[PDB]
Paper text:
The tumor suppressor p53-binding protein 1 (53BP1) plays a pivotal role in orchestrating the choice of DSB repair pathway. Central to the 53BP1 function is the recruitment of 53BP1 to the damaged chromatin via the recognition of di-methylated lysine 20 of histone H4 (H4K20me2) and ubiquitinated lysine 15 of histone H2A (H2AK15ub). More recently, a Tudor-interacting repair regulator (TIRR) has been characterized as a novel 53BP1 regulator, which directly binds to 53BP1 Tudor domain and blocks its H4K20me2 binding surface.
The crystal structure of the complex reconstituted with mouse TIRR and 53BP1 Tudor at 2:1 molar ratio is determined at 1.76-Å resolution by molecular replacement. It is worth noting that the binding of one 53BP1 Tudor to TIRR dimer does not block the Tudor-binding site on the unbound TIRR protomer, suggesting that two molecules of 53BP1 could in theory bind to one TIRR dimer. The complex structure shows that the N-terminal region (residues 10–24) and the L8-loop of TIRR are engaged with a concave surface of 53BP1 Tudor, which is delineated by three loops (L1, L3, and L1′) of 53BP1 Tudor. While the N-terminal region of TIRR engaged with the L1-loop and L3-loop of 53BP1 Tudor, TIRR L8-loop mainly interacted with the 53BP1 Tudor L1′-loop. TIRR residues I12, L20, and W24 in the N-terminal region, together with residue L101 in β5-strand, engage with 53BP1 residues W1495, Y1523. We observed that H4K20me2-bound aromatic cage, which contains 53BP1 residues W1495, Y1523, D1521, Y1502, and F1519, undergoes conformational changes upon TIRR interaction. TIRR uses its N-terminal region coupled with L8-loop to block the methylation reader binding surface in Tudor, thus abolishing the access of 53BP1 to nucleosome bearing H4K20me2.
Numbering used by the authors:
A (entry chain A): 5 to 85, 87 to 204
B (entry chain B): 7 to 203
């Protein structure tokens, strides 16, 4: 169980006054036919990143609406380097963050080929933001090993930007990349792992 | 969780029933400053593994046929891309928490920040990228004004237990961070984790 964030419509988000900050982040993913150890289907690979503050999050950042539309802003704030362009067709959701500052978090999601996803990873290591704001990209493992913790459940027990962890689970669910009951199982495994470490 | 440190010689005398792992801690002094005011001090490479945990580059070495160095370098050739370590880079051997019989050997090498970046570029092109290795990360060793941003948040991630111990061990014995500062970062990380729940 994660703390539920309030979802609002894009139209509502556009009506927000100047006292609201807007963040735009991108969930880039690819179908992945690979099989770990020749037997565990990887299904999809999703990109996240280690941030300067020691937490996992998505590529992106704050967008100043005095100057930019959400899409123009996002494409400018993507510390991936490259030629990838996101459009309003890739817009997925807007959620109000936990605060206390007034922030709406916009999520864009785009499916790429696995070769294109790798090109993004290569671009990122050469990016101006690498080693400053961004400390490295990681692929999310969506599979679970036989021990029932290796892979996705262990991954979910990492330290996230709270908004990004919610957005990841939200997107996996609404984009039909993972059944909800499987997400619940991985999250339960991660949360119990965390609780028993703290004992 | 204190691991028992033993000598290379002791490790070899445990016998054929023991497995050996070798991992490398690659790091660089880093003159950068976060926000132009927070000294970065050093950058250390770790990686996201296939099992969803942070660890160091490296893996199991079959000591029946391989020296620790040759074994390590072959695993690094597939997973980092051709950097080669020597016996001069050997740092420590620890018995891992049981019940499995594993001795964990740690190698450490200081690189320039330029050489460290070359390793990161090599890694994204390596054979193991997207299979056993899911991406490299730099450790943030600084702590932000809120006293959690940076190193304490980082320590609240999920690690191979042995690797987390090895990181803290190496930061101490290599004089990269004072013991009391490490203790302080760990305490903050724990307090973060408990309030997260």
């Amino acid at each position: 169980m994660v703390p539920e964030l309030k979802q609002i419509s894009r139209e509502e988000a556009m009506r927000l006054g100047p006292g609201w900050s807007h963040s735009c982040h991108a969930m880039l993913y690819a179908a992945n036919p690979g099989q770990l150890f020749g037997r565990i289907p990887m299904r999809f690979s999703v990109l996240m990143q280690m941030r300067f503050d020691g937490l996992l999050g998505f590529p992106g950042g704050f967008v100043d609406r005095r100057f930019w539309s959400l899409e123009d802003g996002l494409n400018r704030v993507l510390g991936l380097g490259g030629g990838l362009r996101l459009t309003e067709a890739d817009y997925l959701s807007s959620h109000l963050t936990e605060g206390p500052h007034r922030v709406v978090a916009h999520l864009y999601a785009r499916q790429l080929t696995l070769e294109q996803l790798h090109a993004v990873e290569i671009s990122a290591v050469h990016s101006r933001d690498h080693g400053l704001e961004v400390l490295g990209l990681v692929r999310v493992p969506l599979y679970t090993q036989k021990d029932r913790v290796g892979g996705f459940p262990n991954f979910l027990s990492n330290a996230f930007v709270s908004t990004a962890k919610y957005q990841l689970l939200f997107a996996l669910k609404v984009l039909n990349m993972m059944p909800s009951e499987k997400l619940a199982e991985a999250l339960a495994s991660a949360t119990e792992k965390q609780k028993k470490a703290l004992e």
